[PDB]
Amino acid sequence: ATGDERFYAEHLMPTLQGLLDPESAHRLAVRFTSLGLLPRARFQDSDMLEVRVLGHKFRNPVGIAAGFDKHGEAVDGLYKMGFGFVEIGSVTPKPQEGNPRPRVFRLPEDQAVINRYGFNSHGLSVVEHRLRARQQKQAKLTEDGLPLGVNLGKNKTSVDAAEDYAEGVRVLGPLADYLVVNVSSPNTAGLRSLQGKAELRRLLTKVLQERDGLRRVHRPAVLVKIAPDLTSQDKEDIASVVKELGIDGLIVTNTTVSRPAGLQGALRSETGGLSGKPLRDLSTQTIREMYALTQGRVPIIGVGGVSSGQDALEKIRAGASLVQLYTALTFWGPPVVGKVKRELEALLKEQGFGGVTDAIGADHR
Ligand SMILES: Cc1cc2nc3c(=O)[nH]c(=O)nc-3n(C[C@H](O)[C@H](O)[C@H](O)COP(=O)(O)O)c2cc1C
Ligand SMILES: Cc1ccccc1-c1ccc(-c2cc(C(=O)O)c3c(c2)nnn3C)cc1
Ligand SMILES: CCCCCCCCCCC[N+](C)(C)[O-]
Ligand SMILES: CCCCCCCCCCC[N+](C)(C)[O-]
Ligand SMILES: CCCCCCCCCC[N+](C)(C)[O-]
Ligand SMILES: CCCCCCCCCC[N+](C)(C)[O-]
Ligand SMILES: O=C(O)c1cc(=O)[nH]c(=O)[nH]1
Ligand SMILES: [Cl-]
Ligand code: NA
Ligand code: NA
Ligand code: NA
Numbered sequence: 001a002t003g004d005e006r007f008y009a010e011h012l013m014p015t016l017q018g019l020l021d022p023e024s025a026h027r028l029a030v031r032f033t034s035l036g037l038l039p040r041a042r043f044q045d046s047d048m049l050e051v052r053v054l055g056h057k058f059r060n061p062v063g064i065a066a067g068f069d070k071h072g073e074a075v076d077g078l079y080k081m082g083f084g085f086v087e088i089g090s091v092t093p094k095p096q097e098g099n100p101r102p103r104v105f106r107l108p109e110d111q112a113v114i115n116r117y118g119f120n121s122h123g124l125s126v127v128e129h130r131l132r133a134r135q136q137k138q139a140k141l142t143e144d145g146l147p148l149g150v151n152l153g154k155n156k157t158s159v160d161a162a163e164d165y166a167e168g169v170r171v172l173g174p175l176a177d178y179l180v181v182n183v184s185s186p187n188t189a190g191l192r193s194l195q196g197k198a199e200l201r202r203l204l205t206k207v208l209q210e211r212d213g214l215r216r217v218h219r220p221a222v223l224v225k226i227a228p229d230l231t232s233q234d235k236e237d238i239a240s241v242v243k244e245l246g247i248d249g250l251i252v253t254n255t256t257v258s259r260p261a262g263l264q265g266a267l268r269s270e271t272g273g274l275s276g277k278p279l280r281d282l283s284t285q286t287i288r289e290m291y292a293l294t295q296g297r298v299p300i301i302g303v304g305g306v307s308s309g310q311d312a313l314e315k316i317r318a319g320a321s322l323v324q325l326y327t328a329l330t331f332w333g334p335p336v337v338g339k340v341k342r343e344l345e346a347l348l349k350e351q352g353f354g355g356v357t358d359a360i361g362a363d364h365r
Contacts, residue, residue, distance in 0.1 A: 001339075004039045008333035022104040022113070025330070030069060033077035033334075041082045043338035046345050048355040049084070050145065053299045053321045054221045054249055056177055059145035060084035061356050062312065062340050065303050065324035066151040066180065066225075067115075071122040072130045076137070079146050082337040087324065088127070089151030090182050093167045095123035096155055099187065105272070106330075107265025111307070112279075113327050115255070116272035118187045119153045124171045131175040138175075147177035151225065153185065161194055162206045169210040174218035181207055184227035184254035186273040192227055197237035200224075204245050225251035226290075228282045228304065229258060235286075239293035249299035252290050252320070253283045276327035280305025284318050288363070291319025296361050307336060309343020313351075319361045 016025055032038070049060040063085040064078050072088040079086060098120025105114040127150075131138070138148050152168035154161045165181055173179055181204065183194040194203055204224065211222050224247055226238060242250065255273025263278060283304025291300060302320030306312050307328035315323050328336045344356075353359045 002042060002335065004042070005332070005335040005339050008039070008335045009331070013331060013333045017106065017108070021102070022106050022330075023101065026068075026104065030074050033069075033081065034074040036077045036080055038077060038081055038334050041080060041338060043082060043341055045084070045341065048345055048348055049341060051321055051356050054147075054178055056142065056147045057145040058084045058147060058322060060341055061316070061322045062337060062344075063087060063149075063301070063322060063324040064329075065326040066090055066182070067117075068326050068329070070120065072127045075134070075148065079141060081334050082341065084145070085147045085149065085322065087149035087151055087180065089180065090119055090121065090153030090185070091124055091127050091150065091168065091172065092119050092121040092153045092155045093124050093158075093164050094155050095126070096121055103272070105267040105270045107263065107267055107276070108331070109264040110268070110276065110278055111327070111331055112263070112265065112274055112276035113330060114267060114270045114272040114274050116187045116270070119156070119185065121153065124168060128171050128175065131172065135175060142177055148175075149178040149180060149223075150176035150220075151180040151182050153182050154188065154191065156188060161191070162203045165203065165207050166210045169207055169214075173211055173214050173220050176220045178221040178223055178248070179211070180223050180225050180251055182225045182254070184225050186227070186229075186255060186257045192229075195226060195230065195234055195238060197241060200238065201241045201245070204241060204247060208245060208247070221248035223247065223249040223251050223301065225254055226286070228253035228256045228279065228286050230286070235289055235293060239290060242298055243294060247298070249301065250290055250294075251301045251303060251324075252287045253279070253304050255279065256282060258282075275304070277305045277307070280311060284315050287315055287320050288318040291361060292364065296364065306340065307332065309340055309345070309347050312340055312344045313347050313359065316356060316359050317361070317363045319364065321360050
């Protein structure tokens with residue numbers, strides 16, 4: 001352990017959390033990150049951490065999950081923090097405010113967060129201009145193994161979700177290495193029912209058709225992000241449609257609307273998606289199931305409650321090619337990225353794996 005990790009986890013982050021409400025802390029974090037005001041990223045990525053997936057090289061397999069940088073403002077500072085890939089969003093076609101405040105809650109005794117932001121978004125046009133302004137810099141980053149993903153949502157007033165997602169494909173698809181069809185937000189009425197078989201097949205057919213109409217050089221991979229709250233029938237159906245249509249990968253999982261037994265935080269009954277440690281093994285089991293249902297043929301990005309190298313390796317061994325985190329950053333701060341990477345490398349070596357690639361799906365073999 002480095003000095004920063006302990007100092008941030010034991011002194012800096014508790015003091016910030018005592019001074020600022022959760023959404024103010026989030027906005028300040030985005031601002032400091034966007035300006036590069038961040039502790040010295042003291043970890044050199046070993047070649048063991050490199051992963052080739054989704055038509056790209058990833059210098060390390062630890063990404064920032066959607067929701068931290070909703071409007072594409074802090075992309076370069078997130079690479080400086082040490083993430084191997086960045087996902088921005090969710091972005092909706094038109095700007096919209098999201099739910100009334102308060103809409104984010106800390107559950108520190110659970111190492112968890114509840115949020116009901118409701119897709120607060122600057123809109124596609126604003127994000128489009130932000131990404132265009134650094135598009136060549138991102139081309140170089142991607143070439144160097146630091147790809148960019150864009151997570152697409154839908155407006156609250158939209159009549160047909162498929163036209164919302166199609167517009168996101170047309171506008172931000174050419175600026176992304178991969179797109180994410182977010183059909184699993186718990187905070188937009190009726191959104192998650194897009195996960196059922198008949199609506200999903202029509203929706204994803206339209207999204208793939210639009211993606212295929214982009215010029216080859218600007219054509220992203222398309223992934224679907226699913227909830228952890230699905231029935232077995234839902235998961236079977238999603239796996240079936242993903243394979244029938246040639247979807248490029250899955251993100252597993254979004255936040256949960258459940259409230260597992262044992263939560264201690266005073267705010268556990270707030271409405272919203274729960275993230276962090278109480279989500280961890282629910283997410284890992286959903287990875288394990290979706291990997292088996294897709295025969296290991298569909299790349300998975302595993303996400304939910306990762307704060308250590310062991311947590312990351314469990315998801316990789318369950319079938320994730322890549323992992324993301326968000327909530328751990330809100331408790332440990334920026335040092336958590338280097339921490340997860342260093343512990344993952346040590347554990348790979350300890351378990352006899354030549355690299356991350358050899359551990360993907362290793363529990364199933
Ligand atoms: C405050 C907050 C906002 C989020 N907003 C989004 C979002 O806009 N789009 C999305 O697909 N996921 C969103 N998520 C979900 C995360 O991307 C991730 O799936 C989830 O939080 C589990 O990972 P974690 O336990 O490491 O935080 C949000 C999470 C949090 C905590
Ligand atoms: C300390 C620091 C230095 C340089 C750059 C960034 C940081 C930093 C500081 C705060 C956070 C943070 C905190 C919280 C919270 O609830 O307390 C969040 C968050 C981010 N996003 N959502 N929420 C609820 C993240 C990172
Ligand atoms: C009517 C639409 C007005 C613009 C959309 C609102 C943007 C919300 C900004 C919140 C940013 N953040 C995720 C960091 O809290
Ligand atoms: C306070 C940090 C604790 C980390 C581990 C907490 C255990 C969380 C268990 C999740 C609940 N579950 C869905 C599995 O029943
Ligand atoms: C988001 C609030 C952060 C407060 C503390 C941030 C410390 C800044 C890191 C130090 N330095 C600028 C040299 O990277
Ligand atoms: C082909 C090798 C696959 C895994 C080997 C290393 C695993 C070490 C721990 C195994 N375990 C005791 C947890 O079942
Ligand atoms: O904007 C939000 O409320 C939000 C979106 C999403 O996909 N997941 C989440 O937990 N929150
Ligand atoms: Cl373009
Ligand atoms: Na805000
Ligand atoms: Na089944
Ligand atoms: Na099908």
